Coordinates of C-alpha atoms and ligand atoms in Angstrom, one line a residue:
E1 CA -152.4 90.6 -25.2
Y2 CA -148.7 90.9 -26.2
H3 CA -149.5 88.9 -29.5
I4 CA -146.4 86.7 -29.0
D5 CA -146.8 83.2 -30.4
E6 CA -144.8 80.5 -28.7
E7 CA -143.6 79.2 -32.0
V8 CA -143.0 82.2 -34.2
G9 CA -142.7 85.0 -31.5
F10 CA -143.5 88.4 -32.9
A11 CA -144.6 87.0 -36.3
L12 CA -148.3 86.4 -37.2
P13 CA -148.9 82.7 -36.2
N14 CA -151.0 81.7 -39.3
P15 CA -151.9 84.7 -41.5
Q16 CA -155.0 85.1 -43.7
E17 CA -154.3 84.4 -47.3
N18 CA -157.7 85.5 -48.7
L19 CA -159.7 88.7 -48.1
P20 CA -163.5 88.9 -48.2
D21 CA -165.2 89.1 -51.7
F22 CA -166.2 92.8 -51.1
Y23 CA -162.4 93.4 -51.4
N24 CA -161.7 91.5 -54.7
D25 CA -160.8 94.8 -56.5
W26 CA -157.9 95.0 -54.0
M27 CA -156.7 91.5 -54.2
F28 CA -156.3 91.4 -58.0
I29 CA -154.0 94.5 -58.2
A30 CA -152.0 93.1 -55.2
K31 CA -152.0 89.5 -56.3
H32 CA -150.5 90.6 -59.7
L33 CA -148.0 93.4 -59.0
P34 CA -145.0 91.9 -61.0
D35 CA -147.0 92.5 -64.2
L36 CA -149.0 95.7 -63.6
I37 CA -145.7 97.6 -62.8
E38 CA -143.8 95.9 -65.7
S39 CA -146.6 96.6 -68.1
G40 CA -147.6 100.0 -66.8
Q41 CA -151.3 99.5 -66.0
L42 CA -151.0 99.7 -62.2
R43 CA -151.3 103.4 -61.7
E44 CA -154.4 103.5 -64.0
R45 CA -156.1 100.6 -62.3
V46 CA -155.5 102.2 -58.9
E47 CA -156.6 105.6 -60.4
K48 CA -160.1 104.3 -60.9
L49 CA -161.1 102.1 -57.9
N50 CA -164.0 101.9 -55.5
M51 CA -163.4 103.6 -52.1
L52 CA -164.2 100.2 -50.6
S53 CA -165.4 100.9 -47.1
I54 CA -163.4 99.4 -44.2
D55 CA -166.3 98.2 -42.1
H56 CA -166.6 94.8 -43.7
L57 CA -163.2 93.6 -42.2
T58 CA -164.2 91.7 -39.1
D59 CA -161.2 90.3 -37.3
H60 CA -157.5 91.0 -36.9
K61 CA -155.8 88.6 -39.3
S62 CA -158.1 90.2 -41.9
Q63 CA -157.2 93.8 -41.0
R64 CA -153.5 92.9 -41.1
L65 CA -153.7 91.2 -44.6
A66 CA -155.6 94.3 -45.7
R67 CA -152.7 96.5 -44.6
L68 CA -150.3 94.2 -46.4
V69 CA -152.4 94.4 -49.6
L70 CA -153.2 98.1 -49.3
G71 CA -149.6 98.7 -48.4
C72 CA -148.0 96.6 -51.2
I73 CA -150.2 98.5 -53.6
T74 CA -149.2 101.9 -52.1
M75 CA -145.5 101.2 -52.5
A76 CA -146.0 99.9 -56.0
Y77 CA -148.2 102.9 -57.0
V78 CA -146.1 105.7 -55.5
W79 CA -142.7 104.3 -56.8
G80 CA -144.0 102.7 -60.0
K81 CA -141.2 101.1 -62.0
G82 CA -138.8 102.6 -59.5
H83 CA -136.7 104.4 -62.1
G84 CA -136.9 108.0 -60.7
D85 CA -140.6 108.3 -61.7
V86 CA -142.6 109.0 -58.6
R87 CA -146.3 109.6 -57.7
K88 CA -146.6 112.3 -55.0
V89 CA -150.4 112.0 -54.8
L90 CA -152.1 108.9 -53.6
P91 CA -155.8 108.6 -54.7
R92 CA -158.8 109.3 -52.4
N93 CA -159.9 105.7 -53.4
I94 CA -157.0 103.8 -51.8
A95 CA -155.8 106.3 -49.2
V96 CA -158.8 107.0 -47.0
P97 CA -159.6 103.3 -46.2
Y98 CA -155.8 102.5 -45.8
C99 CA -155.4 105.6 -43.5
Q100 CA -158.4 104.5 -41.5
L101 CA -157.4 100.8 -41.3
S102 CA -153.9 102.1 -40.3
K103 CA -155.5 104.1 -37.5
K104 CA -157.4 101.0 -36.3
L105 CA -154.1 99.0 -35.9
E106 CA -152.3 102.2 -34.7
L107 CA -149.7 101.5 -37.5
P108 CA -148.5 104.2 -40.0
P109 CA -150.2 104.3 -43.5
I110 CA -147.0 102.7 -45.0
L111 CA -145.7 99.2 -45.6
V112 CA -143.8 98.2 -42.4
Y113 CA -142.1 95.0 -41.2
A114 CA -145.2 93.8 -39.5
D115 CA -146.9 93.7 -42.9
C116 CA -144.3 92.7 -45.4
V117 CA -142.6 90.0 -43.3
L118 CA -144.6 89.1 -40.1
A119 CA -148.0 89.0 -41.9
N120 CA -146.7 88.1 -45.4
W121 CA -145.9 84.3 -45.4
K122 CA -147.4 80.8 -45.7
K123 CA -146.6 77.1 -45.3
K124 CA -146.9 75.3 -48.6
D125 CA -147.7 71.9 -47.0
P126 CA -148.9 72.5 -43.4
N127 CA -147.5 69.3 -41.9
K128 CA -144.0 70.2 -42.8
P129 CA -141.7 72.4 -40.7
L130 CA -141.1 76.1 -40.9
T131 CA -138.1 76.0 -43.2
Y132 CA -137.2 78.0 -46.3
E133 CA -138.2 75.3 -48.8
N134 CA -141.6 74.6 -47.2
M135 CA -142.6 78.3 -47.0
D136 CA -143.4 81.3 -49.3
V137 CA -144.6 84.9 -49.1
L138 CA -148.0 86.2 -50.2
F139 CA -146.8 89.2 -52.1
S140 CA -143.8 90.4 -54.1
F141 CA -143.1 93.6 -56.1
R142 CA -141.2 92.4 -59.2
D143 CA -139.5 89.1 -60.2
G144 CA -135.9 88.3 -59.2
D145 CA -136.3 91.0 -56.6
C146 CA -135.5 88.2 -54.1
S147 CA -138.5 89.2 -52.0
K148 CA -138.8 85.6 -50.9
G149 CA -135.2 85.5 -49.6
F150 CA -135.3 88.8 -47.7
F151 CA -138.8 88.4 -46.2
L152 CA -138.5 84.8 -45.3
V153 CA -135.0 84.8 -43.8
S154 CA -136.1 87.9 -41.8
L155 CA -139.2 85.8 -40.8
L156 CA -137.0 82.7 -40.0
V157 CA -134.9 84.9 -37.7
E158 CA -138.0 86.1 -35.9
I159 CA -139.0 82.5 -35.4
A160 CA -135.5 81.4 -34.1
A161 CA -135.8 84.2 -31.6
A162 CA -139.3 83.0 -30.5
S163 CA -137.5 80.1 -28.7
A164 CA -135.5 82.7 -26.6
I165 CA -138.4 85.1 -26.1
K166 CA -140.6 82.4 -24.4
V167 CA -138.0 81.9 -21.7
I168 CA -138.2 85.6 -20.6
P169 CA -141.1 85.0 -18.1
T170 CA -138.9 82.4 -16.4
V171 CA -136.2 85.0 -16.0
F172 CA -138.4 87.6 -14.2
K173 CA -140.1 84.9 -12.1
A174 CA -136.8 83.4 -11.0
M175 CA -135.6 86.9 -10.1
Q176 CA -138.8 87.6 -8.0
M177 CA -138.9 84.0 -6.5
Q178 CA -135.2 84.4 -5.8
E179 CA -134.4 81.1 -7.7
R180 CA -130.7 81.5 -8.8
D181 CA -130.3 78.1 -10.5
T182 CA -133.4 78.6 -12.6
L183 CA -132.4 82.2 -13.7
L184 CA -128.9 80.9 -14.7
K185 CA -130.4 78.1 -16.8
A186 CA -132.9 80.5 -18.4
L187 CA -130.1 82.9 -19.3
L188 CA -127.9 80.2 -20.9
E189 CA -131.0 78.9 -22.6
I190 CA -131.7 82.4 -24.1
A191 CA -128.1 82.7 -25.2
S192 CA -128.2 79.2 -26.8
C193 CA -131.2 80.2 -28.8
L194 CA -129.9 83.6 -30.0
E195 CA -126.8 81.6 -31.2
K196 CA -129.2 79.5 -33.3
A197 CA -130.7 82.6 -34.7
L198 CA -127.2 83.6 -36.0
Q199 CA -126.9 80.3 -38.0
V200 CA -130.4 81.0 -39.4
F201 CA -129.1 84.5 -40.3
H202 CA -126.4 82.8 -42.5
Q203 CA -129.1 81.9 -45.0
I204 CA -129.4 85.6 -46.3
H205 CA -126.4 84.8 -48.5
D206 CA -128.1 81.7 -49.9
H207 CA -131.5 83.2 -50.8
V208 CA -130.8 86.9 -51.6
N209 CA -128.6 88.4 -54.3
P210 CA -126.7 91.6 -53.4
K211 CA -127.2 93.3 -56.8
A212 CA -130.8 92.2 -57.0
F213 CA -131.7 93.4 -53.4
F214 CA -130.0 96.8 -53.6
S215 CA -131.5 97.6 -57.1
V216 CA -135.0 96.3 -57.0
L217 CA -136.5 95.6 -53.6
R218 CA -134.7 98.3 -51.6
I219 CA -136.7 100.9 -53.6
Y220 CA -140.2 99.5 -52.7
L221 CA -139.4 99.3 -49.0
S222 CA -138.3 102.9 -48.8
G223 CA -140.7 105.6 -47.3
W224 CA -141.4 109.3 -47.5
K225 CA -139.6 110.3 -44.3
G226 CA -136.3 112.1 -45.0
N227 CA -136.9 111.5 -48.8
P228 CA -135.4 113.9 -51.3
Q229 CA -138.0 112.5 -53.8
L230 CA -140.8 113.2 -51.4
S231 CA -139.2 115.9 -49.2
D232 CA -142.6 117.5 -48.4
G233 CA -144.0 114.0 -48.0
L234 CA -146.9 111.9 -49.6
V235 CA -150.3 113.5 -49.7
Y236 CA -153.2 111.2 -48.5
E237 CA -155.8 112.9 -50.7
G238 CA -159.1 112.8 -48.7
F239 CA -157.8 111.9 -45.3
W240 CA -155.1 114.5 -44.4
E241 CA -155.4 118.2 -45.3
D242 CA -151.6 118.0 -45.8
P243 CA -149.0 115.4 -47.0
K244 CA -147.6 113.3 -44.1
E245 CA -144.0 111.8 -44.2
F246 CA -143.6 108.3 -42.9
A247 CA -140.4 106.2 -42.9
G248 CA -140.1 103.0 -45.0
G249 CA -140.4 99.4 -43.5
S250 CA -137.1 97.7 -42.7
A251 CA -136.2 94.9 -40.3
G252 CA -135.1 97.8 -38.2
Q253 CA -138.8 97.9 -37.2
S254 CA -138.2 94.3 -35.8
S255 CA -138.9 94.0 -32.1
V256 CA -136.5 91.1 -31.6
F257 CA -133.1 92.9 -31.1
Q258 CA -134.9 95.7 -29.1
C259 CA -136.6 93.0 -27.0
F260 CA -133.2 91.7 -25.8
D261 CA -131.6 95.1 -25.5
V262 CA -134.4 95.8 -23.0
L263 CA -134.3 92.4 -21.2
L264 CA -130.5 92.7 -20.7
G265 CA -130.8 96.3 -19.5
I266 CA -128.8 97.6 -22.5
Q267 CA -129.7 101.4 -22.5
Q268 CA -129.8 101.9 -26.4
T269 CA -132.6 104.4 -26.2
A270 CA -130.7 106.5 -23.7
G271 CA -128.6 109.5 -24.8
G272 CA -129.2 111.8 -27.7
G273 CA -128.3 111.1 -31.3
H274 CA -129.8 109.2 -34.2
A275 CA -128.9 105.8 -32.7
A276 CA -131.2 106.1 -29.7
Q277 CA -133.8 108.4 -31.3
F278 CA -134.0 106.1 -34.4
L279 CA -134.5 102.9 -32.3
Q280 CA -137.1 104.8 -30.2
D281 CA -138.9 106.1 -33.3
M282 CA -139.1 102.6 -34.8
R283 CA -141.4 101.4 -32.0
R284 CA -144.2 103.4 -33.8
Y285 CA -143.9 101.0 -36.8
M286 CA -144.3 98.0 -34.6
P287 CA -147.8 96.7 -33.7
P288 CA -149.1 98.3 -30.5
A289 CA -149.3 94.8 -28.9
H290 CA -145.5 94.6 -29.4
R291 CA -144.8 98.1 -28.3
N292 CA -146.7 97.2 -25.1
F293 CA -144.5 94.2 -24.6
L294 CA -141.2 96.1 -24.8
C295 CA -142.8 98.7 -22.4
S296 CA -143.6 95.8 -20.0
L297 CA -140.0 94.5 -20.1
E298 CA -138.7 97.9 -19.2
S299 CA -141.2 98.1 -16.2
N300 CA -140.0 94.8 -14.8
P301 CA -136.9 94.8 -12.5
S302 CA -133.4 94.9 -14.2
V303 CA -132.0 91.5 -14.9
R304 CA -128.6 93.3 -15.3
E305 CA -128.8 94.9 -11.8
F306 CA -130.0 91.6 -10.3
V307 CA -127.0 89.8 -11.7
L308 CA -124.5 92.4 -10.6
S309 CA -126.0 92.5 -7.0
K310 CA -125.4 88.8 -6.4
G311 CA -121.6 88.4 -6.9
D312 CA -122.0 85.2 -8.8
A313 CA -119.7 84.5 -11.7
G314 CA -122.1 81.8 -13.0
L315 CA -124.9 84.5 -13.6
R316 CA -122.4 87.0 -14.9
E317 CA -121.2 84.4 -17.5
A318 CA -124.7 83.5 -18.7
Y319 CA -125.7 87.2 -18.8
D320 CA -122.6 87.9 -21.0
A321 CA -123.5 84.8 -23.1
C322 CA -126.8 86.6 -24.0
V323 CA -125.0 89.9 -24.6
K324 CA -122.3 88.3 -26.7
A325 CA -125.0 86.5 -28.8
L326 CA -126.7 89.8 -29.4
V327 CA -123.4 91.5 -30.4
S328 CA -122.5 88.6 -32.7
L329 CA -125.9 89.0 -34.4
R330 CA -125.3 92.8 -34.9
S331 CA -121.7 92.1 -36.0
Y332 CA -122.8 89.7 -38.7
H333 CA -125.7 92.1 -39.7
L334 CA -123.0 94.7 -40.4
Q335 CA -121.3 92.3 -42.9
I336 CA -124.6 91.8 -44.6
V337 CA -125.0 95.6 -45.0
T338 CA -121.5 95.8 -46.4
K339 CA -122.2 93.1 -49.0
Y340 CA -125.8 94.2 -49.8
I341 CA -125.6 98.0 -49.7
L342 CA -122.1 99.4 -49.4
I343 CA -120.5 97.4 -52.2
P344 CA -123.6 97.5 -54.6
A345 CA -124.0 101.3 -54.0
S346 CA -120.5 101.7 -55.4
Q347 CA -121.3 100.0 -58.7
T348 CA -120.6 110.0 -46.6
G349 CA -124.2 108.5 -46.5
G350 CA -122.9 104.9 -46.4
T351 CA -120.5 105.9 -43.7
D352 CA -123.4 107.4 -41.7
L353 CA -125.4 104.1 -42.0
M354 CA -122.4 102.0 -40.8
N355 CA -121.7 104.4 -37.8
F356 CA -125.4 104.2 -36.7
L357 CA -125.2 100.4 -36.6
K358 CA -121.7 100.4 -35.1
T359 CA -122.8 102.8 -32.3
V360 CA -125.7 100.4 -31.5
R361 CA -123.3 97.4 -31.8
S362 CA -120.7 99.2 -29.5
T363 CA -123.5 100.1 -27.0
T364 CA -124.4 96.4 -27.0
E365 CA -120.7 95.4 -26.6
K366 CA -120.2 97.8 -23.7
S367 CA -122.8 96.0 -21.5
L368 CA -120.5 93.0 -21.1
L369 CA -119.4 92.4 -17.5
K370 CA -116.0 90.7 -18.1
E371 CA -115.3 93.5 -20.5
Ligands
HEM401 C1 -129.9 92.0 -46.9 C2 -130.4 92.0 -45.7 C3 -130.4 93.2 -44.8 C4 -129.9 94.5 -45.1 C5 -129.4 94.9 -46.4 C6 -130.2 95.2 -43.9 C7 -129.8 96.6 -43.9 C8 -130.0 97.3 -42.8 C9 -129.8 98.7 -42.7 C10 -129.3 99.6 -43.8 C11 -130.2 99.2 -41.4 C12 -130.1 100.6 -40.9 C13 -131.5 101.1 -40.7 C14 -132.3 101.2 -42.0 O1 -131.7 101.6 -43.0 O2 -133.5 100.8 -42.1 C15 -130.6 98.0 -40.7 C16 -131.0 98.1 -39.4 C17 -131.5 96.9 -38.8 N1 -131.6 95.7 -39.3 FE1 -131.2 95.1 -41.0 N2 -130.7 94.5 -43.0 C18 -130.8 93.2 -43.4 C19 -131.3 92.1 -42.7 C20 -131.8 92.1 -41.4 C21 -132.4 91.0 -40.8 C22 -132.7 89.7 -41.4 C23 -132.7 91.4 -39.5 C24 -133.4 90.7 -38.4 C25 -134.1 89.6 -38.7 C26 -132.3 92.8 -39.4 C27 -132.5 93.6 -38.3 C28 -132.1 94.9 -38.3 C29 -132.3 95.7 -37.1 C30 -132.9 95.3 -35.7 C31 -131.9 97.0 -37.4 C32 -132.0 98.2 -36.5 C33 -130.6 98.4 -35.9 C34 -130.3 97.5 -34.7 O3 -131.1 97.3 -33.8 O4 -129.2 96.9 -34.7 N3 -131.7 93.1 -40.6 N4 -130.6 96.9 -41.5

């Protein structure tokens, strides 16, 4: 109901690799994107396609793979080589079934995190763990874009967080059942696991190149929203009378950080300003199952308030453990941004970026009880 696996959390537990046959037109373009962009015969092959009706997609894992395919195609079509040459008009052939499918899942008709990370992976040998070496994506855009690195390390962090997320019910039960000792354990447990997920985060150095990321992959993950290059938007010819602007799919559409902001009663989405508004806006780009879950956390009693009520340094400590773990993650994520965007982009937009993240970080910092 909340679509949260015990093992991989927000991620898609075991995603469909193969579409039905009726959608083989789709799978070839998508399967082979490194070549059709680098040759030039993507936009022409997308130009003349069959408006393949959506009805023949039975179950979920199908519909999600379809979004991934359709979406990967739409990024590749609209941006092309990604050298300042842009397609403002998306065909009636690709747009109408993608816009429909996207209405089925209540996701935007754009590549989002749910698609290009959560739904976009595979174990190579299914008896071997979920580790970088024994995993791979289903789709890239170009070669040496380091799509594997970005998508998988993202995914791996999702999975690290699954171990924390599955504790959450214990937290709310313990609170209701008035079981202090449990609640304390569960909170420390959560902090412990969010600390793991930091180590996991270290891998982004190993498996992604700054110059390669910023240049190649960053372009294909960008969206029409607040886009000089598509200021008016992208026209979904057939479906929408007008062009509709939708933001690109980052890990800022991840539920993980938001999940724990909410659990720990960190009022990020309170106040005006980009910081809150952005975070709030991003929930749209999450699956509705996952939106529901964050809404449910909010509805439950405040862990923060409970902890403060009790006058119990034990709880306070464990609470702060979680909060510190979350700050640490955001603190490290900042260093990543420096390395992978700031420095590249130089070989006050970059200052705006950093101030968004630092507000969010600071907001998270301020929820500490010792400080
Ligand atoms: C090279 C790797 C990465 C880069 C360059 C990067 C860059 C950014 C940037 C520029 C933003 C600001 C919003 C936006 O532009 O979309 C952002 C936000 C965000 N990123 Fe990343 N990111 C990276 C990896 C990750 C990973 C692996 C995660 C989680 C697994 C993550 C989680 C987030 C979250 C949750 C936000 C929203 C702000 C927040 O809640 O703190 N990022 N990232």
